[PDB]
Amino acid sequence: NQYDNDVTVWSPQGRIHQIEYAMEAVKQGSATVGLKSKTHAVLVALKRAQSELAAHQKKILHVDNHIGISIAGLTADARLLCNFMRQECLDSRFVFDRPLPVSRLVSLIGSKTQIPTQRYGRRPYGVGLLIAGYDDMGPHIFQTCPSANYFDCRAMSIGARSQSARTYLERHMSEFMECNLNELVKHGLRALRETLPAEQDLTTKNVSIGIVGKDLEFTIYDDDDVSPFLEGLEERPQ
Amino acid sequence: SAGFDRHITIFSPEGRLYQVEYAFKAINQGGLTSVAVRGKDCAVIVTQKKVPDKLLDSSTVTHLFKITENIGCVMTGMTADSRSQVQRARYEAANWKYKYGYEIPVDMLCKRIADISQVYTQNAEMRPLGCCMILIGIDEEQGPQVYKCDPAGYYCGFKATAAGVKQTESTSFLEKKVKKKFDWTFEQTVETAITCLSTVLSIDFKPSEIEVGVVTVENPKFRILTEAEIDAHLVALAE
Amino acid sequence: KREVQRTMLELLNQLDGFQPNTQVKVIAATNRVDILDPALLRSGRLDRKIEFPMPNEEARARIMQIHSRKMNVSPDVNYEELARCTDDFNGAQCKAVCVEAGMIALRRGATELTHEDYMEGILEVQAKKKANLQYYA
Amino acid sequence: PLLHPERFVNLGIEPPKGVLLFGPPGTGKTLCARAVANRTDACFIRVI
Amino acid sequence: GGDNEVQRTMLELINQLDGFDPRGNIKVLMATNRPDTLDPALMRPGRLDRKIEFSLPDLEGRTHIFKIHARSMSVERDIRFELLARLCPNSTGAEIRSVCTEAGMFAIRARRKIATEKDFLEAVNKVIKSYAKFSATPRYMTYN
Amino acid sequence: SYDRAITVFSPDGHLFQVEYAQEAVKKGSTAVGVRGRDIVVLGVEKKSVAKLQDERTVRKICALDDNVCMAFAGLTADARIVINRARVECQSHRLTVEDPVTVEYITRYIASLKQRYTQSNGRRPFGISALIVGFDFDGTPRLYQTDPSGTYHAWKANAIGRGAKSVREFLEKNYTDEAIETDDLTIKLVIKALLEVVQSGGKNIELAVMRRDQSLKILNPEEIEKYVAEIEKEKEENE
Amino acid sequence: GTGYDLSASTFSPDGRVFQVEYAMKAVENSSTAIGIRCKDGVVFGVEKLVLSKLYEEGSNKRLFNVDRHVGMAVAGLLADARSLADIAREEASNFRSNFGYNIPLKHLADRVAMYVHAYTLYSAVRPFGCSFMLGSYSVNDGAQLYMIDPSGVSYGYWGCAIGKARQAAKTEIEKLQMKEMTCRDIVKEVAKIIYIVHDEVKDKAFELELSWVGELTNGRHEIVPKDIREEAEKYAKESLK
Amino acid sequence: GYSFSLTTFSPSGKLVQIEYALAAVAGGAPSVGIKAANGVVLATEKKQKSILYDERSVHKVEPITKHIGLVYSGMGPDYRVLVHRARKLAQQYYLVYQEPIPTAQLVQRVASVMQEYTQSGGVRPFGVSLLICGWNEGRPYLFQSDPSGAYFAWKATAMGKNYVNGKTFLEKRYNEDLELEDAIHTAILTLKESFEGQMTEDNIEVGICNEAGFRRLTPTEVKDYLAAIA
Amino acid sequence: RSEYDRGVNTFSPEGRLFQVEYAIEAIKLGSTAIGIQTSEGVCLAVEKRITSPLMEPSSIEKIVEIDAHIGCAMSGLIADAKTLIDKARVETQNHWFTYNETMTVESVTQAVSNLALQFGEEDADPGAMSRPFGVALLFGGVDEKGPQLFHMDPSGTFVQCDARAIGSASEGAQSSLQEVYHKSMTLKEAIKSSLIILKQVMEEKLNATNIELATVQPGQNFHMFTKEELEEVIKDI
Ligand SMILES: Nc1ncnc2c1ncn2[C@@H]1O[C@H](COP(=O)(O)OP(=O)(O)OP(=O)(O)O)[C@@H](O)[C@H]1O
């Protein structure tokens, strides 16, 4: 197939294959989940460990007081995007002195990621994101995509082995709204557990949490800070 | 031969720019036709308009453009490329008027467009813009003037010309007519053009099926003809 | 496109300008049709040609459902997602996906299949050998 | 599958009935084939 | 169409393998060095459901193969197999057998009764870093 | 992966283009260098004058600065360019910091230049492997050797060019603190080193000795003949 | 035809570009979007598809406001469309700044179209993969409607449909008397048209997006207010049964 | 294998693309140039594909300056391009030195610009060849230039289609010495040698380069010369 | 493989980005290095792997001093290592100048990574060369947070690791470390274990000139190469 090597060539069926390959790249990462009540947006991530000794990779990145990010896919693209995001939020605060609405930020990210799919000269950004924020219109959980397409998801999960997570979210999608913070977090990490294989179980080492609330600046919990949430969670069904 | 020299604008054994050659086939790809004629004191352009779907503002579909108050143009071939070339021509006419202080003679404008096309074909990284153009105007002390361009950058002045799919038959018929001795009065010119188009296509078109644009020495303004007037001319041609 | 030539001539004349009645019907299947002689199809000879397109995502999911009917599949499975992932596949490949997912489940001792099993099967049939590739967290 | 078809029948799973071994030369595919032939306890047929 | 005979033979083979009513108890194995040349008809699953790829053994596999081969040899117990397995980056078990034989022959040439690590590492140099390895081997002053 | 690109890796990981570049160096005339206790010497084959040609133009040993000398092996034009850049760099460095360049600094600079040319496509790496030597302030002998890949090293004594392998083996076998006791001993060491590979030419040798901190003086052929006579006399004596 | 379609800067022996042709084929596969023009204003109707049931309502809207007095409906690669929208919005902004009044729709539709066409002239950049419509209204000029395709040709329409079932939509639009109906009544029909061509069996759930412009909105573009879309949608279902 | 890019060398000979451009030049309208004792003459065939075309619209011999003519063979648009360039160069020289450009300098400048397009890249070389008249300093000049960038200096030549026959006839007829009128007769004769169809006052273009400035001949004069035998 | 290796601007059907796996493989042909972090400090051991007696052993620089409290060990292409080391030193000095303090180990590793990530951004710092770098680094240093050991890879990823081994023979060294390490180690014990592992891995018998060792502990500066102590350390073992 000679229609596959470049991103600026249309397939005879009307497709750009490099985009599908970036989709796969996003599939290459690990799992990640996001939920939102009326008040809080909670995004949970499962982080791998390259070896036993090394410390698990970071999966949640602090972007602003009201904006938090989970990544899956290429690390380089993740870091570049995170830098872009941080810079844009800072400029908005400097010029207007107000938090940047999540939707405008996601729109900017899409407009930036689109260009590499059009002009030959750089690969499409191969990283999928979960953006959890709180603005005047309450919480938001957006999900971007290497194709420069973004979605306003009420509860979404992306990454390797995320189908089970999505099915669980849909099944219990009804009551995610009125639930409090603790219940929301419990649902999120229960979904993540569902993504985990049968043997392994969630532990205070390989799970990280991020929360942005109506009155709560974005906070990242890892290691012992996560024990309060995990403890009390229902035993894994068998 | 062909097989290697058929992807970029570079020479071939028995020097042959195949790309510019393919541009002309692209021009024919439109599926239309046009005919221009030059009279004693007038010039006429005729084209066939094909609205295939009723849900379409017939006014918005047109192939006669006004390059300048006195200079009229008709385009043929790929639509978007023709529009781009038309815009370039308008720009060049405006620039000439601004810099030198008088309306651009038709021949010079045609030359400018030809030069642009030539520079495009010489250097790579730009498609040859496969659309052909015909210009009509009135030049003081020179009478009516008709000129034609081509994507290859060649241009020339004509006494009568055709473009599009039926170019060859139309031009043969026009030559047959021209070798005959006629005065070519305004009515005569329009009748000749419409007759040539009809005979080439054998259609006996209704008054909404074709567009006409004429420039006359009495009123150098390039005026697009209206349905009533074209219908009157057509019936008169039927006698 | 000489024994084979004689045989094809025999069959052709057998079906050529003969059997005006419809009491006898034949179906000929070809893996590829570019080496079959044009005389075969002709016009009044084999004009009935049935192209078989490449199964589509909906068709692929339907095929997996068909072949998985006997299997003990947990309802959670999402055939639509599997079809979306399984690009440029055929019925045989889908059947292989089903049977080999069943094999994976048996290997791990599972009583019933699961979406992850089908994903593993799809990755396996092409022999992709999925593994953690670093620089991808 | 040949020794204990009961397990396969339980889940209604069919043996592949055919395997293609491939890889760069010298891997041992022929070695593995002869090895399994040692413990086959059934008729094994090579080819020429 | 000079291959028509082999082609028809293969077509008969594949047809008898699968299609209509096969026996269903015929376990078929196939070994080819370059499957890419194989036709679509045979490679399509159903006829050949399983695909077992035999890749180059990893480090641990190489250590295991070294231990398996060398056990019969008469050698001092102090040799580090893992070192050797590392020294052969990507080599099939055939090369491991070759280096075992080469080390034994080196020992014989020295009129010795037991092989030592030196025998093994020079054998390795012979069977791997001596055929095509000679480019950056002397000018390794690029990697440190 | 393949070789027709500087900036492409291989499944093994090599950058084949630069490995190929090293062969050009390997194909040049031999050069040798040794670092004494108070003297630094280098010698070159520099053979085969073409009957009707001058020799003052064919230069293989050149002085970068009043306290740093250099001798190369590889493509001649590339050597010329590198030498010119090194000289300009030495003077500029003395301009910005009013201290003479230490040999290590200039070796690092040259290696960086070669690496930069190795960096990207559209630029062919230098097919040159130089050999720098000299003294710096505080008067410490030093010898450095660079490679087209952009890496450099310090040696007590080393050789490059064709037959550099045999010369290197001989040096490592013979180099000892005794051989460095006096200047003449080092000169004789280098002379015999070259003799081991330059055949019995004798007149196909050019030796540049930077005695401590005076100047890079090129030995007159007669002196080389004298030293060769001494070497042969000693060889006869020990036999 | 192979060997000639790897880039948009090459001509086929038959004399035609192929990348442009491929792009058009990439748009046809998109979901439908129809727009018809009433005497007093213009109406757009889009058939957005719902995926995964997890997307918040109104996700990735396919109706945009390039300007307060202009609209846009898109079909094809959404990512590309969004890029065009910002180009349009910028294009209108410059016009107002440079001249000082709302941009005529006919002119803007031309300027944006030129942009799309310019992307099918170079081998470095692929042609756009989205076809979109434009609509506006104003007392000075009256209702207007335009359509644009990847090739970059912009004709003005009385009723247009772009997407999978453009044929079925156009077929149904023809039997409406757009030349004389009031835009309020048009809305009811547009709902019916989409539902007729929806093909619920082979596409699953969908959301009906509707857009308004006309003297009913004082020459302003805004989505049809809820409780009107509800009425039309209720009627559309009724007509189906 | 090679002969696609104007950069790489053949594995023996020379670049090919330039040779192919020369070939394109060969298959063009006939042209003839005769350097007389006291002037220069240029002639070219100018036949339209039909009677519709206007023969007074586009010319093939053009004045670069008051005393430097120019005729071409090969493609036309390139001829327009480099005639414009040559006019620019002549004007620049006049501005700098306040003196009419001597012909040789113009020829070499034009050759430089022409070879400029043969350098690397996608910029294909000119597919035309030029003959230049000129009467500076008191003696006529006739130069030829080609896409290769080399410029010769002929006494009398003919290029384009069937140039071999023209060259043979030229070396047969023109000896060394003629006036402008006899040179014109020889030139029209040479064109007729290979010209197809009856020649008229409108089929061919003729220009002269004297000690009054280069000038193109009007249809009446060319008709007169065409008459009177020859 | 099946194509897609000719550049870093093309994905694969499985999404993998070749020309990065290959760069990772590149480091596999360097001399092994080991780094162990304990409460008392960070110890780095490396196999010098000399080739010819003539060459000065010091010229083979495998363990550089990034700063008074940050040391680095590299294994891969030498030129890439040199460029990265220079970047780290420059950026440390710049940070000290602007904020008048000593930069953390994590910050230095991340600053280097930001340069290592820019393969083909087309608007990168002068350290971008289209192809990825081919060197893996180990940074060890004592900062406000105690002793820290960070590992890098050409992809740009970096990670904290208490015990690590890189370069040719990294696999076996990692396997050993995984079973000899325990959080309550003492710097002397860590050094002895590192040496025992290293010598067990290398083919050549351990010698005072074979290896290079360095250590950084809270009280002391990095500038302790244990030069001429190597003899003592080895002969105790
Ligand atoms: N552990 C091992 N793994 C693999 N091969 C081994 C091993 N130990 C020894 N070998 C030798 O490796 C060789 C691999 O050859 P194999 O059995 O693949 O046949 P072959 O002649 O290589 O055919 P092909 O090249 O097509 O595989 C055998 O001769 C086998 O004895």
Short mmCIF file of all heavy atoms in Angstrom, two decimals, chain G residues 34-61:
data_model
loop_
_atom_site.label_atom_id
_atom_site.label_comp_id
_atom_site.label_asym_id
_atom_site.label_seq_id
_atom_site.Cartn_x
_atom_site.Cartn_y
_atom_site.Cartn_z
N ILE G 34 -28.98 19.25 5.46
CA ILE G 34 -29.75 19.90 4.41
C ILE G 34 -30.05 21.32 4.83
O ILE G 34 -30.17 21.63 6.01
CB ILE G 34 -31.05 19.12 4.10
CG1 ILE G 34 -31.95 19.05 5.33
CG2 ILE G 34 -30.72 17.73 3.63
CD1 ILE G 34 -33.32 18.49 5.02
N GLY G 35 -30.18 22.19 3.83
CA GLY G 35 -30.55 23.56 4.08
C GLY G 35 -31.38 24.11 2.94
O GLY G 35 -30.98 24.02 1.78
N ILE G 36 -32.54 24.68 3.26
CA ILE G 36 -33.43 25.23 2.25
C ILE G 36 -33.68 26.69 2.58
O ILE G 36 -33.55 27.12 3.73
CB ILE G 36 -34.76 24.46 2.17
CG1 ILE G 36 -35.25 24.09 3.55
CG2 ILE G 36 -34.58 23.20 1.34
CD1 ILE G 36 -36.54 23.34 3.52
N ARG G 37 -34.04 27.45 1.56
CA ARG G 37 -34.13 28.90 1.66
C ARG G 37 -35.58 29.33 1.45
O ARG G 37 -36.13 29.15 0.36
CB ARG G 37 -33.22 29.56 0.63
CG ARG G 37 -33.76 30.85 0.06
CD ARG G 37 -32.71 31.54 -0.77
NE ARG G 37 -33.15 32.85 -1.22
CZ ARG G 37 -32.69 33.47 -2.29
NH1 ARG G 37 -31.75 32.93 -3.05
NH2 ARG G 37 -33.18 34.66 -2.61
N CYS G 38 -36.18 29.89 2.49
CA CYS G 38 -37.51 30.45 2.40
C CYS G 38 -37.43 31.90 1.96
O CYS G 38 -36.36 32.49 1.88
CB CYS G 38 -38.22 30.34 3.75
SG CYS G 38 -38.05 31.83 4.74
N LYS G 39 -38.59 32.49 1.68
CA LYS G 39 -38.59 33.87 1.20
C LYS G 39 -38.07 34.82 2.26
O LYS G 39 -37.24 35.69 1.97
CB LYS G 39 -39.99 34.27 0.74
CG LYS G 39 -41.09 34.02 1.75
CD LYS G 39 -42.39 34.64 1.29
CE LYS G 39 -43.35 34.84 2.44
NZ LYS G 39 -43.26 33.74 3.45
N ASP G 40 -38.55 34.69 3.49
CA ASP G 40 -38.09 35.53 4.60
C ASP G 40 -37.15 34.72 5.49
O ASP G 40 -37.51 34.25 6.57
CB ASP G 40 -39.27 36.07 5.39
CG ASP G 40 -40.13 34.97 5.98
OD1 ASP G 40 -39.98 33.80 5.56
OD2 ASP G 40 -40.96 35.27 6.87
N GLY G 41 -35.92 34.54 5.02
CA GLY G 41 -34.87 33.94 5.82
C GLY G 41 -34.37 32.64 5.22
O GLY G 41 -34.66 32.29 4.08
N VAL G 42 -33.61 31.91 6.04
CA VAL G 42 -32.97 30.67 5.63
C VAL G 42 -32.94 29.73 6.82
O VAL G 42 -32.90 30.17 7.98
CB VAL G 42 -31.54 30.93 5.10
CG1 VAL G 42 -30.74 29.66 5.07
CG2 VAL G 42 -31.61 31.57 3.73
N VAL G 43 -32.96 28.43 6.55
CA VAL G 43 -33.00 27.41 7.59
C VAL G 43 -32.00 26.31 7.26
O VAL G 43 -31.87 25.91 6.10
CB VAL G 43 -34.41 26.83 7.74
CG1 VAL G 43 -34.36 25.47 8.39
CG2 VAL G 43 -35.27 27.77 8.54
N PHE G 44 -31.31 25.83 8.29
CA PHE G 44 -30.40 24.70 8.16
C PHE G 44 -30.89 23.56 9.02
O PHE G 44 -31.49 23.77 10.08
CB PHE G 44 -28.99 25.06 8.61
CG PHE G 44 -28.32 26.10 7.78
CD1 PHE G 44 -28.30 27.41 8.19
CD2 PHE G 44 -27.71 25.76 6.60
CE1 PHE G 44 -27.68 28.36 7.44
CE2 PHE G 44 -27.09 26.72 5.84
CZ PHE G 44 -27.08 28.02 6.26
N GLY G 45 -30.64 22.34 8.56
CA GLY G 45 -30.98 21.16 9.33
C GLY G 45 -29.89 20.12 9.23
O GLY G 45 -29.53 19.71 8.12
N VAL G 46 -29.37 19.68 10.36
CA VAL G 46 -28.26 18.74 10.41
C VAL G 46 -28.69 17.52 11.19
O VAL G 46 -29.51 17.62 12.11
CB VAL G 46 -27.01 19.38 11.05
CG1 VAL G 46 -25.91 18.35 11.17
CG2 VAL G 46 -26.56 20.57 10.24
N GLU G 47 -28.13 16.38 10.84
CA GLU G 47 -28.48 15.11 11.47
C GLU G 47 -27.22 14.58 12.16
O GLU G 47 -26.48 13.77 11.60
CB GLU G 47 -29.00 14.14 10.43
CG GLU G 47 -29.18 12.71 10.92
CD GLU G 47 -28.56 11.69 9.99
OE1 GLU G 47 -27.76 12.07 9.11
OE2 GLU G 47 -28.86 10.49 10.14
N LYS G 48 -27.00 15.04 13.38
CA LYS G 48 -25.84 14.61 14.15
C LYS G 48 -26.07 13.21 14.70
O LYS G 48 -27.18 12.86 15.11
CB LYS G 48 -25.57 15.58 15.29
CG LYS G 48 -24.29 15.30 16.03
CD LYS G 48 -23.97 16.40 17.03
CE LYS G 48 -24.82 16.26 18.28
NZ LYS G 48 -24.53 17.33 19.27
N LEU G 49 -25.01 12.41 14.71
CA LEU G 49 -25.07 11.04 15.20
C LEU G 49 -24.51 10.98 16.62
O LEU G 49 -23.54 11.66 16.94
CB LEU G 49 -24.29 10.10 14.29
CG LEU G 49 -24.78 9.98 12.85
CD1 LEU G 49 -24.22 8.71 12.23
CD2 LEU G 49 -26.28 9.98 12.78
N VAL G 50 -25.12 10.14 17.45
CA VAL G 50 -24.71 9.97 18.83
C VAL G 50 -23.92 8.68 18.94
O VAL G 50 -24.35 7.63 18.44
CB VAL G 50 -25.93 9.94 19.78
CG1 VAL G 50 -25.48 10.11 21.22
CG2 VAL G 50 -26.93 11.01 19.38
N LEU G 51 -22.76 8.74 19.58
CA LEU G 51 -21.88 7.60 19.74
C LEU G 51 -21.63 7.34 21.21
O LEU G 51 -21.35 8.27 21.98
CB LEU G 51 -20.55 7.83 19.03
CG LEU G 51 -20.57 7.94 17.50
CD1 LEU G 51 -21.49 6.89 16.90
CD2 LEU G 51 -20.99 9.33 17.08
N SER G 52 -21.76 6.08 21.61
CA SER G 52 -21.34 5.63 22.93
C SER G 52 -22.29 6.10 24.03
O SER G 52 -22.16 5.68 25.18
CB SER G 52 -19.93 6.14 23.24
OG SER G 52 -19.98 7.41 23.86
N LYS G 53 -23.24 6.97 23.70
CA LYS G 53 -24.24 7.36 24.68
C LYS G 53 -23.61 8.07 25.88
O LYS G 53 -24.31 8.42 26.83
CB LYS G 53 -25.02 6.13 25.14
CG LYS G 53 -26.24 6.43 25.97
CD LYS G 53 -27.04 5.17 26.23
CE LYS G 53 -28.17 5.42 27.21
NZ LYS G 53 -27.66 5.79 28.56
N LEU G 54 -22.29 8.29 25.84
CA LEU G 54 -21.58 8.93 26.93
C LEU G 54 -21.26 10.38 26.65
O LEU G 54 -20.80 11.09 27.54
CB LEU G 54 -20.26 8.20 27.21
CG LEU G 54 -20.31 7.06 28.22
CD1 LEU G 54 -18.97 6.38 28.28
CD2 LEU G 54 -20.72 7.58 29.58
N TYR G 55 -21.49 10.84 25.42
CA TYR G 55 -21.19 12.21 25.06
C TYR G 55 -22.27 13.12 25.61
O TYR G 55 -23.47 12.82 25.53
CB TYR G 55 -21.12 12.36 23.55
CG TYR G 55 -19.93 11.68 22.92
CD1 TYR G 55 -19.59 10.38 23.23
CD2 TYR G 55 -19.15 12.34 21.99
CE1 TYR G 55 -18.51 9.77 22.65
CE2 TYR G 55 -18.07 11.74 21.41
CZ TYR G 55 -17.75 10.45 21.74
OH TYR G 55 -16.67 9.85 21.16
N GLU G 56 -21.86 14.24 26.18
CA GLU G 56 -22.82 15.23 26.63
C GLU G 56 -23.60 15.76 25.44
O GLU G 56 -23.09 15.87 24.33
CB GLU G 56 -22.11 16.37 27.35
CG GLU G 56 -23.02 17.18 28.25
CD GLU G 56 -23.56 16.38 29.40
OE1 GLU G 56 -22.74 15.82 30.17
OE2 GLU G 56 -24.79 16.29 29.54
N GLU G 57 -24.87 16.08 25.68
CA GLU G 57 -25.70 16.59 24.60
C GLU G 57 -25.08 17.85 24.02
O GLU G 57 -24.48 18.66 24.73
CB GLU G 57 -27.11 16.89 25.12
CG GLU G 57 -27.98 15.67 25.28
CD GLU G 57 -28.13 14.89 23.99
OE1 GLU G 57 -27.95 15.50 22.92
OE2 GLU G 57 -28.43 13.68 24.05
N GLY G 58 -25.22 18.01 22.71
CA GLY G 58 -24.62 19.14 22.04
C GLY G 58 -23.14 19.00 21.77
O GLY G 58 -22.51 19.98 21.37
N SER G 59 -22.57 17.82 21.99
CA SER G 59 -21.16 17.63 21.73
C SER G 59 -20.86 17.82 20.25
O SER G 59 -21.67 17.47 19.39
CB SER G 59 -20.72 16.24 22.16
OG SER G 59 -19.63 15.79 21.38
N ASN G 60 -19.70 18.39 19.97
CA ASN G 60 -19.20 18.57 18.60
C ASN G 60 -20.32 18.99 17.66
O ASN G 60 -20.67 18.31 16.71
CB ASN G 60 -18.50 17.31 18.11
CG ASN G 60 -19.37 16.08 18.20
OD1 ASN G 60 -20.51 16.08 17.74
ND2 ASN G 60 -18.84 15.03 18.80
N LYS G 61 -20.88 20.16 17.96
CA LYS G 61 -21.92 20.72 17.11
C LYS G 61 -21.40 20.90 15.69
O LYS G 61 -20.24 21.27 15.48
CB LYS G 61 -22.39 22.05 17.66
CG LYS G 61 -23.51 21.93 18.67
CD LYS G 61 -24.02 23.30 19.09
CE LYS G 61 -22.97 24.09 19.84
NZ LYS G 61 -22.26 23.28 20.87
#
